[PDB]
Amino acid sequence: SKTHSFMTVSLIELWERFGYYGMQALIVYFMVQRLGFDDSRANLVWSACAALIYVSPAIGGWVGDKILGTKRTMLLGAGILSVGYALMTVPTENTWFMFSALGVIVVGNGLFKPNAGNLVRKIYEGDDSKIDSAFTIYYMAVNVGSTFSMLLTPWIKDYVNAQYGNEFGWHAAFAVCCVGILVGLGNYALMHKSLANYGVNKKSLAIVLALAALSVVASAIILEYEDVARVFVYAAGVAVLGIFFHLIRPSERAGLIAALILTVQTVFFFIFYQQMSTSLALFALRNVDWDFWTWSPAQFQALNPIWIMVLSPVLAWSYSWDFSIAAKFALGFAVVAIGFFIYGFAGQFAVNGKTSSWVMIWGYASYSLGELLVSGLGLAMIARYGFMMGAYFVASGISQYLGGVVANFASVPQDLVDPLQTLPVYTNLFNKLGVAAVVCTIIALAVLPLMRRLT
Ligand SMILES: C[C@H](N)C(=O)N[C@@H](C)P(=O)(O)O
Ligand SMILES: [Zn+2]
């Protein structure tokens, strides 16, 4: 009976991320192509949205576990997400229409993501090794879903734009997101009834919905106003750095210092990882050309889940059987390093103004493999000496915005359309970032003896 209970929760996650990534691939292009955003702001706005999205399940996790139901909060978040993309199907209107929609997605995410995952931790089966195996199948469930989205939505965006100019076009794609949610939540979520935590308090339901609407407003204001989010992130940074400042204040130092390095490396990693949704997505837009009527530049992001699915069974194959396998951080950075250098040396070979189509295929292959290697991100993994549920998680949220400030180094002015000139600024970033990625590789191994010391 464990199988059925896991199958449903996995299918809802599949369609949820279908809608989510189906939106992610296109949103930054939407701000640039349909709306008139410059890559500078487009990167910042999307990256602040990502920061909020990452940091969202913090509040909502506690909501489903202590305030309302786990299954109920999950279902609620899914409906909120549904109305989130529902808001994305209306034309242009005030710019504030989108920011609000994003804010709704923020809130929806926070109520779905942690609880849907909590169910997998609970049912099938609960306090067993099976959990780790389960979360991998669940991990794959995301990748299969986000595949069909990141391939269909830009294709539907392109196709509908050809039949009817501007509207729906992009909004047709956002409607695809919407109906995806209405497919997962609309079917699978009510097909089975599994046991959760609370199982509804109307006073608590109300106070939650009110605060959720308010959070949509507050998110919209941080997204629209560039400087506001900048201050919000800065404040969050002084916060995280302060917590670590109090934690370190002889024997505990061996773990804490290591954790401090780990968290910053995690921060570093998220920076690299955001590039593909930002700067690398923009680089790919200034090269729609594809060899391998199709194929759209946003479709390049789909390489990520596709590569993960094909490299996963390769990595699971192990001849081993030990301890301090934190060297996988270094390898990861190292593999990310050459990935960026692929884009770095893209300007040299295969260029007709600005070409290199396969450069994205092999590049993303390297990104996905590096992401695959740093799977043990766990906040408890760094906690060897317990304020990591905050400081670390928040730091990992802050980093998402930092990825946009780093993407901004490759921001092409709106008046610059000549691909022969856009190419170098992108490669110069990618060539720099690869080098920076080697620096972390060194960092990861320099901190290795500190992991050897505590054990
Ligand atoms: C599909 C994508 N590569 C992925 O696995 N994402 C998970 C880490 P998330 O959907 O929880 O961010
Ligand atoms: Zn170089």
XYZ file of N, CA and C in Angstrom, residues 237-347:
333
model
N 21.521 39.413 4.652
C 22.934 39.086 4.688
C 23.602 39.457 6.003
N 23.276 40.649 6.494
C 23.770 41.077 7.799
C 23.200 40.140 8.864
N 21.989 39.655 8.626
C 21.399 38.680 9.518
C 22.179 37.352 9.572
N 22.397 36.741 8.410
C 23.096 35.455 8.387
C 24.547 35.543 8.926
N 25.264 36.585 8.504
C 26.621 36.805 8.977
C 26.657 37.047 10.501
N 25.616 37.691 11.036
C 25.583 37.931 12.462
C 25.392 36.630 13.220
N 24.507 35.759 12.728
C 24.272 34.475 13.399
C 25.561 33.664 13.489
N 26.291 33.588 12.375
C 27.587 32.882 12.422
C 28.642 33.543 13.384
N 28.535 34.878 13.473
C 29.410 35.662 14.351
C 29.166 35.287 15.817
N 27.918 34.982 16.169
C 27.610 34.588 17.546
C 27.882 33.102 17.802
N 27.734 32.269 16.772
C 27.976 30.833 16.911
C 29.424 30.523 17.220
N 30.346 31.207 16.525
C 31.763 30.923 16.815
C 32.279 31.413 18.205
N 31.613 32.406 18.774
C 31.972 32.929 20.091
C 31.637 31.946 21.218
N 36.857 26.091 21.458
C 38.044 25.411 20.931
C 37.707 24.125 20.178
N 36.908 23.258 20.798
C 36.516 21.993 20.178
C 35.395 22.190 19.149
N 34.489 23.129 19.413
C 33.371 23.397 18.510
C 33.862 24.031 17.196
N 34.965 24.781 17.294
C 35.549 25.508 16.160
C 35.893 24.640 14.943
N 36.306 23.400 15.198
C 36.636 22.472 14.122
C 35.441 22.214 13.191
N 34.228 22.228 13.730
C 33.083 21.933 12.895
C 32.488 23.194 12.319
N 32.343 24.188 13.187
C 31.711 25.447 12.849
C 32.438 26.157 11.721
N 33.764 26.235 11.823
C 34.533 26.878 10.768
C 34.315 26.113 9.469
N 34.290 24.784 9.562
C 34.086 23.975 8.380
C 32.710 24.275 7.801
N 31.721 24.407 8.680
C 30.374 24.660 8.234
C 30.355 26.001 7.523
N 31.109 26.961 8.071
C 31.107 28.298 7.517
C 31.668 28.260 6.118
N 32.631 27.379 5.898
C 33.215 27.296 4.580
C 32.178 26.628 3.689
N 31.547 25.578 4.204
C 30.594 24.816 3.420
C 29.466 25.690 2.950
N 28.900 26.454 3.870
C 27.804 27.313 3.504
C 28.241 28.322 2.427
N 29.450 28.879 2.534
C 29.812 29.857 1.526
C 30.000 29.176 0.197
N 30.473 27.944 0.220
C 30.628 27.244 -1.035
C 29.260 26.944 -1.605
N 28.316 26.609 -0.732
C 26.975 26.367 -1.197
C 26.511 27.636 -1.861
N 26.780 28.773 -1.215
C 26.399 30.055 -1.776
C 27.025 30.189 -3.161
N 28.328 29.923 -3.242
C 29.043 30.002 -4.499
C 28.354 29.142 -5.533
N 27.969 27.926 -5.153
C 27.381 27.035 -6.133
C 26.085 27.603 -6.679
N 25.258 28.154 -5.790
C 23.959 28.612 -6.264
C 24.159 29.725 -7.252
N 25.266 30.435 -7.078
C 25.533 31.543 -7.973
C 25.731 30.968 -9.372
N 26.590 29.953 -9.487
C 26.850 29.350 -10.765
C 25.521 28.837 -11.300
N 24.705 28.254 -10.415
C 23.537 27.549 -10.935
C 22.470 28.496 -11.462
N 22.507 29.724 -10.986
C 21.475 30.658 -11.403
C 21.778 31.155 -12.801
N 23.042 31.056 -13.204
C 23.421 31.621 -14.484
C 22.579 31.052 -15.602
N 22.329 29.749 -15.542
C 21.615 29.097 -16.628
C 20.205 29.611 -16.821
N 19.602 30.157 -15.773
C 18.254 30.722 -15.891
C 18.313 32.184 -16.264
N 19.482 32.787 -16.064
C 19.694 34.211 -16.326
C 20.629 34.468 -17.491
N 21.887 34.744 -17.175
C 22.877 35.155 -18.169
C 23.015 34.167 -19.321
N 23.017 32.873 -19.008
C 23.157 31.800 -20.011
C 21.882 31.624 -20.841
N 20.763 31.972 -20.232
C 19.507 31.960 -20.944
C 19.494 33.113 -21.953
N 20.049 34.266 -21.549
C 20.186 35.447 -22.417
C 21.216 35.246 -23.526
N 22.348 34.635 -23.194
C 23.348 34.229 -24.168
C 22.670 33.307 -25.197
N 21.877 32.334 -24.730
C 21.169 31.412 -25.637
C 20.117 32.109 -26.504
N 19.536 33.192 -25.985
C 18.563 33.998 -26.736
C 19.214 34.774 -27.866
N 20.457 35.184 -27.648
C 21.234 35.861 -28.686
C 21.940 34.833 -29.556
N 21.359 33.635 -29.581
C 21.758 32.526 -30.471
C 20.623 31.451 -30.522
N 19.532 31.776 -31.217
C 18.392 30.865 -31.349
C 18.756 29.651 -32.205
N 19.737 29.851 -33.085
C 20.263 28.826 -33.999
C 20.463 27.460 -33.382
N 19.791 26.461 -33.943
C 19.872 25.117 -33.407
C 19.914 24.061 -34.539
N 20.838 23.118 -34.404
C 20.961 21.976 -35.293
C 20.244 20.745 -34.721
N 20.524 20.459 -33.445
C 20.059 19.214 -32.807
C 18.717 19.345 -32.163
N 9.164 26.149 -36.498
C 9.333 24.720 -36.779
C 10.412 24.130 -35.904
N 10.598 24.719 -34.714
C 11.579 24.260 -33.708
C 13.076 24.495 -34.176
N 13.982 24.889 -33.263
C 13.836 24.772 -31.788
C 14.176 26.089 -31.061
N 13.247 26.496 -30.188
C 13.276 27.729 -29.383
C 14.447 27.874 -28.433
N 14.899 29.111 -28.172
C 16.064 29.241 -27.278
C 15.781 28.922 -25.790
N 14.552 29.132 -25.363
C 14.271 28.779 -23.980
C 14.400 27.233 -23.831
N 14.266 26.514 -24.949
C 14.221 25.076 -24.894
C 15.569 24.585 -24.436
N 16.575 25.457 -24.489
C 17.887 24.990 -24.087
C 17.917 24.613 -22.591
N 17.096 25.278 -21.780
C 17.090 25.024 -20.335
C 16.622 23.588 -20.069
N 15.874 23.023 -21.022
C 15.351 21.666 -20.865
C 16.462 20.657 -20.858
N 17.651 21.085 -21.286
C 18.802 20.196 -21.327
C 19.090 19.731 -19.915
N 18.777 20.594 -18.952
C 19.119 20.283 -17.579
C 18.468 18.999 -17.041
N 17.121 18.918 -17.046
C 16.464 17.681 -16.580
C 16.744 16.453 -17.463
N 16.885 16.694 -18.757
C 17.158 15.611 -19.683
C 18.517 14.955 -19.388
N 19.525 15.784 -19.168
C 20.853 15.274 -18.850
C 20.886 14.570 -17.497
N 20.176 15.134 -16.526
C 20.097 14.542 -15.196
C 19.493 13.150 -15.250
N 18.435 12.996 -16.034
C 17.812 11.686 -16.169
C 18.715 10.631 -16.835
N 19.536 11.066 -17.790
C 20.399 10.149 -18.532
C 21.736 9.873 -17.808
N 22.169 10.803 -16.965
C 23.410 10.622 -16.226
C 23.165 9.970 -14.870
N 21.924 9.997 -14.405
C 21.599 9.412 -13.107
C 21.853 7.912 -12.988
N 21.443 7.126 -13.997
C 21.711 5.691 -13.879
C 23.189 5.356 -14.053
N 23.928 6.285 -14.642
C 25.362 6.110 -14.832
C 26.088 6.278 -13.489
N 25.711 7.305 -12.732
C 26.294 7.568 -11.409
C 25.882 6.578 -10.309
N 24.684 6.013 -10.439
C 24.176 5.042 -9.470
C 24.984 3.750 -9.554
N 25.592 3.519 -10.715
C 26.451 2.365 -10.941
C 27.785 2.613 -10.242
N 27.993 1.935 -9.118
C 29.206 2.128 -8.328
C 29.919 0.818 -7.941
N 31.232 0.794 -8.124
C 32.043 -0.377 -7.807
C 32.503 -0.329 -6.348
N 32.288 0.820 -5.717
C 32.706 1.072 -4.344
C 31.875 0.268 -3.334
N 32.550 -0.571 -2.545
C 31.915 -1.351 -1.481
C 30.810 -2.289 -2.007
N 33.572 5.839 1.614
C 33.873 5.441 2.988
C 33.539 6.542 3.995
N 34.316 7.622 3.962
C 34.121 8.742 4.878
C 34.662 10.050 4.293
N 34.027 11.175 4.636
C 34.435 12.511 4.156
C 34.478 12.598 2.623
N 33.335 12.297 2.028
C 33.169 12.274 0.588
C 32.705 13.664 0.183
N 33.234 14.661 0.897
C 32.963 16.082 0.657
C 33.829 16.579 -0.504
N 34.710 15.705 -0.978
C 35.527 15.961 -2.154
C 34.642 16.068 -3.400
N 33.434 15.519 -3.306
C 32.451 15.610 -4.368
C 32.039 17.069 -4.571
N 32.255 17.927 -3.573
C 32.025 19.355 -3.752
C 33.070 19.857 -4.762
N 34.331 19.515 -4.509
C 35.417 19.968 -5.347
C 35.206 19.496 -6.782
N 34.990 18.188 -6.939
C 34.736 17.602 -8.246
C 33.611 18.360 -8.926
N 32.552 18.652 -8.161
C 31.394 19.331 -8.704
C 31.809 20.666 -9.281
N 32.501 21.472 -8.473
C 32.962 22.781 -8.919
C 33.850 22.602 -10.136
N 34.689 21.559 -10.092
C 35.653 21.295 -11.144
C 34.908 20.996 -12.436
N 33.865 20.171 -12.321
C 33.059 19.828 -13.493
C 32.271 21.067 -13.964
N 31.852 21.912 -13.024
C 31.174 23.124 -13.439
C 32.193 24.028 -14.122
N 33.430 23.973 -13.646
C 34.466 24.842 -14.165
C 34.610 24.682 -15.679
N 34.913 23.462 -16.139
C 35.084 23.242 -17.576
C 33.794 23.521 -18.318
N 32.660 23.390 -17.634
C 31.405 23.689 -18.287
C 31.378 25.139 -18.745
N 31.817 26.034 -17.870
C 31.812 27.442 -18.180
C 32.845 27.739 -19.243
N 33.938 26.974 -19.236
C 34.990 27.204 -20.213
C 34.521 26.759 -21.572
N 33.553 25.831 -21.620
C 32.991 25.450 -22.914
C 32.387 26.742 -23.526
N 31.589 27.440 -22.709
C 31.013 28.691 -23.173
C 32.146 29.726 -23.365
N 33.197 29.585 -22.553
C 34.345 30.452 -22.633
C 34.983 30.304 -23.993
N 35.140 29.059 -24.465
C 35.844 28.881 -25.723
C 34.851 28.719 -26.804
N 33.617 29.151 -26.532
C 32.627 29.045 -27.590
C 32.849 30.084 -28.713
N 33.401 31.234 -28.343
C 33.613 32.327 -29.270
C 34.662 31.996 -30.304
